[PDB]
Structure formats: structure tokens, C-alpha cells
Amino acid sequence: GSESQLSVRVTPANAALKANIEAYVGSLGERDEAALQRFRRNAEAQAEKAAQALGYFQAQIDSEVKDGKPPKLTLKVVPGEPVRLRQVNIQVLGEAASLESFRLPSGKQLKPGAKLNQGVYEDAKRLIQNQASRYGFFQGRFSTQRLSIDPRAGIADIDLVYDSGQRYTFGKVSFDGDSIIEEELLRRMVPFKAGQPYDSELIAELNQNLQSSGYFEGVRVDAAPTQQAIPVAVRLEARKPRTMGVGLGFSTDVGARARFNWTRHWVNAEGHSLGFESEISAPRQNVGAWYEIPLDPPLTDKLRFTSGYQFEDLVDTESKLLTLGGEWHSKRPDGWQRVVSLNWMREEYKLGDDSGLSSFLMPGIGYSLLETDNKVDPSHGYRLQFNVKGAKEGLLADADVLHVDAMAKGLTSFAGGHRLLGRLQVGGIATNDYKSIPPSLRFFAGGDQSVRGYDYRTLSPENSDGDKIGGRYMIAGSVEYQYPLAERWRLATFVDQGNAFNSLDFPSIKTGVGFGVRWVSPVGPLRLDLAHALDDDGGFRLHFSMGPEL
């Protein structure tokens, strides 16, 4: 069996108190009568702690033991009337009294009439002192601290008066270390000026800033209140000038896969970045290079020049694609990153048996947004991506083009860890010469991340002879439910719908449904799905994939 039963009866009923007592007492285990009898004093003790945490200081607690199958330790309890706050005086004086973002202790638990809960008082005090320390009120002193309780007549008074005194400020920022990065650049990624009101989260922001620039392998950003201005000392350890990286992966879409990167994290004092990268899979190989120049602000604004070469043999198309490009990234405080681009490309291609070659110089604008709990175990978050590019034939273009692609990903956790995943992707290309439009600019659907139940890029318009050539438009959507089965183990069920097509009037949407297993393994998030195609002649398909959900 064999677990012994614990029964808590409160008169009158009080579900809160009951559940609390049940959690505090814990599990009885597989204890027999004698063993339950030894356990009684612990049981009553725990029960009265549990009562005290909810404000009941006059709870009558008694315990019965009854042998049986299984044995039963019954707790009977008369709550009595609890302790309620009468007077509550929480005051923050000094400069902090006028500071906008200084949270005062608030809420139901501190309203007069509320049952006094364990540690709401200490919570209030901790909050006040934590914000005091965050905002540099280091001379902040509690002038009054009083929690007063009379269990008889059930009254409690809280008195917290906090004289905050003057607010400290940021002193000068100093930089030392074997970094060749000019201080001109380093100072433009300091999220505060000197003589500006102190904020420890700005120190943190500085820390993460320096860390994310890629320029160093270690940063020491420290400045304990000292010396009213706090000087800030930053020491920087220059990163290794060059770096190599290798990755292995697998997919149902493309199979075994190898990634390589060769990065140069600082080329010069002005913070330029160099890079090389490649990936090899049986159906697709590509190589790319890039150069980056920080603008202002250095971290959210930059120029990125790129080049690339890519071979692809997939389904019924082949393509050798060459590309050069200039990009201008800027990100607003939302998290909205805009990318203004000018890209030139040349594509050698075979659609079915028809060989084409066309080239385009195209401008584009993109918007991105990523908001998550993060970062490997996101419990909720979302990704938004919008991208439009276009070309004018004559102006270094073999055809006219208006290419649009958009994606939205979303994840939510609700209840006891049940997840819901939502996915939408849309694409469209307008042109006056579809035959001149190469594969990379056409749209395809189906696959692990597209419409499961269907092989990668197989959902597509076909020509006279039955070859999948690419759509003028596409949609792909999915809804997935995940059930937590263990730590690192989830059980999913999903529905995907989508297609690539040439006519808005005949989308011919295909549907896949199925279920799979998710595992946060020692090599990354693994997903294994079994999917049934409902449309065309649908059999079954095994999908496998790795990488973050978002």
C-alpha cells in the first residue's frame, strides 16, 4: 500500500487553515498505530505553527489515533478568532518620500481588518530596506520598528517609520584592464552619467552591457558605497582575439548537420567585429562572412556587412545562391529591433528541369521583438518577426519584387505547469515575372517547424509534370499543448495547418495532427513527434528536432 491517512477537521470549516495544517504536518508515511502515537506531539506542534502563520493564536488543537487499513491520525481543531491588524502605520520619510519608483508596502495583507500573516511585517521591512539599498539611501535608518500583538482580543499593530536621509549619486567611472577598446566607446555604453541618482540596477545593466559586447572574457564592475558620490571601478580582461566553434545537430528536415564558426571579437579600438560561419548538411551547405561596426548606442545600434554562399538540393529544386549585404540595426527600449537593409543576390537555380539565373539588388526593412522568461527553460514568452524587401527591375533587378514574411511564436504556462504553444507564419511575394523568381524568394511548407505530418518543403504548388516549384503565398500555423510528466520531461499533443500556394482563392490548407515527447537532455531541448497527415494521402511521420522552443 500503504500510506497512513491524515484527516484534518476544522470546526467550522476553513479550507485555508486545513490545507496549511496538512502542508505543515506533512505526510504520515507508512506508520502503524504506535508510530502514529509517537508522532502526535509533532502533529499538534506543526498544526499550531500552521495556525499561527494564518493569524490564529488561540486554536484548540487535539489529536485522535485510530488503527485500521490504513491507520488514521485525525487532527481536530477549533480555530478561534484570529489576530487582525488594527493600526498599520508604514511611513517612508526623507528624500525617498518623493521618489516615484520607491514601492511602499501595500496590499490586502496590510489593510486594517486582515488576519495577520506570518512575516508580512518582515516582508514590508525587507522591501523598504531593499529599495533603500537599490536607490542609494545608504544612510537610511529605521527610526521605528514595531510589531505588536495581543492574541487575547486578537489585535495587532504595525509601526514602521523609515527616515531615508539623502540619496547618494553616481561618481566618476574608471576603466582599467588590457582592453584596447577606446574609452570613447566604453563610456557610451554606460547607462548613467555622473552626478545622476544612484541605481544598483544601472550598475547591473553596465555589467551586462560590457559582458554582451563580446569584447572581454571577464568584467569586474564594482563600487560599494564609499567616499555624496560613489565612484565606479570597472576592470576588463580582453577576450582571446580569435575563436573557433563547432556544433553537431540532427533534424528530420535535413538530417545530420555540422556547424562551424570563426569569430574575431575585436579587430580594432573602435570595436569592429569580424566573423566566418558555415553549415554542412546533405541537402544544404552554406558559408558566410560578416563585419560589424558599432554606431551609437554601441550595443543596440550597428552596421553589419555580410556575404554568403549557399547550395541547396531540396525536393525538386536546386539553387546556388550568392549574397552581399549591408544592414543597419537599431533597437528601441521596447525591445523592438529594426533592421534596415540593402542586399544584393545572384541565384543559379533549377526548378524541376527548368534552369534559370536571376539577380536582384533589394532594399528591406525588418522588425523583431523577443520577450521571454528565458533563456533555456522559458516558461512563457513570445517572438514577433516582420520583414519586407523589394526590387525594381531595371534598377539592378531581373524582375519586380515585393517579398513579405512574418512570424509569431508564443508560449504560456498555466495551472501546475501546463504549457500552450502557438505558432503562425505568413508569406507573400508580388511580382510581374514569376518565372524569373528563384527558389529562395518562393515559399514552401511542411516539416518539423512548419506543418508536421508532411516532409520538409513538400507542401508546394506543382507544375505540369508534378514537380513542387514553390508558392507565391504561404501560411503555416500550429497549436501545441504540453503536459509536465517529470522534471525535464514533457508530453505534447499538437495540430498544424498550412500550405504554399499560388492563389489566394485556393489555399488548399493541409492539416497534420499528432503527439510527441519533449526532453531537456544533456545536449539540449529534444523534441520527438509522431504526426498524422489528414490531407492528401496521409500516413504517419516521425519528426525530430532540437533547439529552444522560441
Ligand X SMILES: CCCCCCCCOCCOCCOCCOCCO
Interface positions with ligand X (CB under 6 A): 248-250, 255-256, 402, 404, 406, 415-416, 426-428, 430, 473, 475, 477, 479-481, 483, 493-495, 497-498, 509, 511, 523, 534-535, 546
Q: What is the DSSP string of 223-237?
A: --S---EEEEEEEEE
Residue 411 CB, shortest distance to ligand X, in Å, is 13
523: left (phi over 0), alpha (psi -120 to 50) or beta: alpha
Nearer to ligand X, 365 or 509 (CB): 509
Residue 113 CB, shortest distance to ligand X, in Å, is 33
Nearer to ligand X, 322 or 369 (CB): 369
Nearer to ligand X, 364 or 428 (CB): 428
Nearer to ligand X, 289 or 546 (CB): 546
Residue 153 CB, shortest distance to ligand X, in Å, is 41
Cis before 2? omega within 30: yes
Q: How far apart are CA 127 and CA 135, in angstroms?
A: 12
Block residue for cell numbers 490504513: 70
**Computed over its alpha carbons, how large is the radius of gyration of the chain?**
32
Q: Do 235 and 219 form a contact (C-beta atoms < 8 A)?
A: yes
Grid coordinates in use for 451?
Answer: 506543418
Buried b (16+ CB within 10 A) or exposed e, 314-332: bbbbbbebebebebebebe
Q: Which amino acid is located at 184 in the chain?
A: E
Grid coordinates in use for 20?
Answer: 496549511
Residue 9 CB, shortest distance to ligand X, in Å, is 26
Q: Output DSSP code: residue 377.
A: S
Nearer to ligand X, 99 or 388 (CB): 388
Buried b (16+ CB within 10 A) or exposed e, 20-49: bbbebbeebeebeeeebeebeeebbebbbe
Nearer to ligand X, 349 or 473 (CB): 473
Residue 497 CB, shortest distance to ligand X, in Å, is 4
205 Cβ contact list (under 8 Å, min separation 6) = 191
CB-based contacts of 154-157 (< 8 A; 24+ apart in sequence):
154/55, 154/57, 154/58, 154/81, 154/82, 154/83, 154/84, 155/83, 155/84, 155/86, 156/83, 156/84, 156/85, 156/86, 156/116, 157/85, 157/86, 157/87, 157/88, 157/89
Shortest CA distance to 271 belongs to which of 213, 189, 195, 344?
Answer: 213
Nearer to ligand X, 293 or 421 (CB): 421
Mark out the alpha helices in 54-150 (DSSP H runs): 120-134
Nearer to ligand X, 213 or 343 (CB): 343
Residue 119 CB, shortest distance to ligand X, in Å, is 27
Nearer to ligand X, 57 or 494 (CB): 494
Residue 312 CB, shortest distance to ligand X, in Å, is 17
Residue 509 CB, shortest distance to ligand X, in Å, is 4
Residue 47 CB, shortest distance to ligand X, in Å, is 25
Task: Indicate the residue whose CB is closest to ligand X.
Answer: 428
Alpha-carbon separation of residue 240 from 226, 263, 375, 440 (angstroms): 34, 10, 25, 37
First to last CA, the chain: 43
Alpha-carbon separation of residue 100 from 95, 141, 199, 345, 522 (angstroms): 11, 20, 13, 52, 45
Residue 84 CB, shortest distance to ligand X, in Å, is 33
Residue 421 CB, shortest distance to ligand X, in Å, is 9
Block residue for cell numbers 487575547: 152
Nearer to ligand X, 177 or 538 (CB): 538
Nearer to ligand X, 215 or 501 (CB): 501
